[PDB]
Subunit: 157 residues, 6 copies
């Protein structure tokens, strides 16, 4: 019966994200990873690539599925008969902005947002910082799932 | 079946607490409110009084129950076959300390902590500040369950 | 002969802004709302539109007026015989940057900045988030002056 | 007929406090410094001493007066026909708690709180840290009114 | 020639502390761990016990020595011909207070303070939280050096 | 022999930067100021101009040198046989992002980051805010080295 949506651009998914997915899947009957797309900015990976990388690293989570979307997150959530968001916290999270969005999302659609801190080991990776470090040759292999790392290097070369 | 524990001293329970209880009860199959009592610091209300006040306030939540506890929160959680905590955020929450405890609790017992911000209307009330304001004749009736406000006036008279 | 300036881009003015205007108007003899125009981003509303929307929403504040400005805010303030700014705080305010600007503004022109938190009900609206949500069909009518809301609907339709 | 109250324990008043008093006195017709007395901790200085030290240091502010208070700050403010508090910010201010109190005080009594950052030179002094440092022989003479500094030396010797 | 002081109560030293000691020792010619004592509060471990636990876990650091003291940290630093403090940051650090103290310490004695974040794995341990968790039976064995853990358990039993 | 790198874009160098340079040079045997240049975003001053301005400002620091760099900061550091970064903190620093980068930089290359707060007097200046204020005729001469202020006026005329 219970369920939550884990949203993000996941460009690419990191081990910080996967940690949060795993916790959500352990605590809710169903979890949907929402790959949210801005149709007006391309990013590094296509939607199909993003989804494939997530699926390949979540194969051990039977109650997790992955879908893309755009527009209001709360519409994505409600159209699936759910009303909870689970969002990860890491070092460098703009928490004040996350709080603003959470209060807005509850106001307009009655959707709750639960925050969970990612594991310390994965607390300083972000999609953007991983892409930046890898661009200049830094080793981010320990911070990304195998489904991502060499595809990332491929894009960069 | 899913479940979480909502911990606190609840001396007394506020509408900020209740808002969090309601959201937990909406998103988890089972919720236990843990009235965590300190042997040294005896508050305003007895443990039994606090439990009664929470029960009155949560009468419409059939999947939520109220229990007292002492010692390690993660033991309270695990002893009941669960491994999630839901904790509310308000204006004045020491979030950095909450994060420290969340990471400690995950490390020592594998228990996850989910944070949810209370509604803006209930975001500035706290048990301590409500008692302080009421003590000097300030009106905090919009911030507490009606039955709590009734009892609070009694303990002050 | 006290006075303060309330600065912003107000694209559009929200009830968060209006709350702050009202408090400023209640505590200073004279208030000037400074609509600061950019060198891009050209907003959703023109400067005249922003001004009218503010004027419409502050008709019950006789000691408040609305003017556009370019260049340093402190020059705007000082050229009107004042040396106080009143700035509102909301969820998602970059307070660290506001503090930096406050200390700079005091240094270069002797202008004080007073910060006041907007009401909890209006604490999660911002001009940008209201436009984003409204764009995707979300109901922000409770968060904007009724006048402004209709204009916004017009700009989108 | 504008006015604001500047609250604190002022044990003793610092140049950080005085800076804020001066700004408040510059922007409001009438300023009242509220020396709020505790039920313990009895400070280093008695209430009369704290008051005299503030009076001594604000002799050049004709529109400022100094009074002691007990009970709710909002009652102190309202019983004097005002509804504004001016509170200073320094390095080490618990701003989250100040925000909580500000929202509570607006709720229960309609009193606004305006925050202003003290000058960088005075941004790291507090009454407690000045007493601690002076106790162990550190020179805090640049951080306190000359009068106050001599009195402090007297209390220690 | 170069050198820094690493201060704290170290009651007991944690692996978070040791991480910071190691970094300091790697970056300064000499490092002194300052075990600062309040002669008016006993703590769990005696000064000799604290020092022994630090020495036993820093034996692989030839340029680190351990000394106790009280009163002003900057006097401890300057009397050793040094003028730098290295202080660790962890989850739950009151950074605003650390900044206040750093600015005060530079003002009164010209001593610089360098902050370094402890490793993620050790970022949520503190002496106080470790003592609290161990008191109620939680497993903190991975967060403390071998020189500490069973001595801690001994004190508690 | 010890050493650290002080990184930035320094467009232009400010007295806040200089304060940090001086403290690094006082505490490490060797300091390298790394003028990190971005191929996309060309600022106000050329790399050569920025280096010259830093050299003029640091003439009294014989153990500090100035070099340009591109790419990974940790590579710049390691290529010079060092493994420490000294970074300044000011009002408006995004400290959460600095922490994220520090933990990333330690992970990918073993490089430590030490943070030091700049003096209160120089705590609200930034390269960007200085340029912005100067552009509109505001006086930031107390906030910049004299030779920098001279050059800044030139690039604006």
């Amino acid at each position: 019966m219970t369920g939550a949506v884990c949203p993000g651009s996941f460009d690419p998914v990191t081990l910080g994200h996967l940690d949060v997915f795993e916790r959500a899947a352990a605590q809710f009957d169903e979890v949907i990873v929402a790959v949210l797309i801005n149709p007006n900015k391309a990013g590094m990976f296509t939607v199909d690539e993003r989804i494939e990388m997530i699926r390949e690293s979540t194969a051990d989570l039977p109650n997790l599925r992955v879908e893309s979307g755009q527009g209001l997150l709360v519409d994505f959530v409600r159209e699936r008969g759910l009303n909870a968001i689970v969002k990860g916290l890491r070092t460098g999270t703009d928490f004040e902005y996350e709080l603003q969005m959470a209060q807005m999302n509850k106001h307009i659609a009655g959707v709750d947002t639960f925050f969970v801190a990612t594991a310390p080991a994965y607390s300083f990776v972000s999609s953007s910082l991983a892409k930046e470090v890898a661009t200049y040759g830094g080793d981010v292999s320990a911070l990304l799932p195998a489904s991502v790392h060499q595809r990332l290097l491929g894009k960069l070369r």
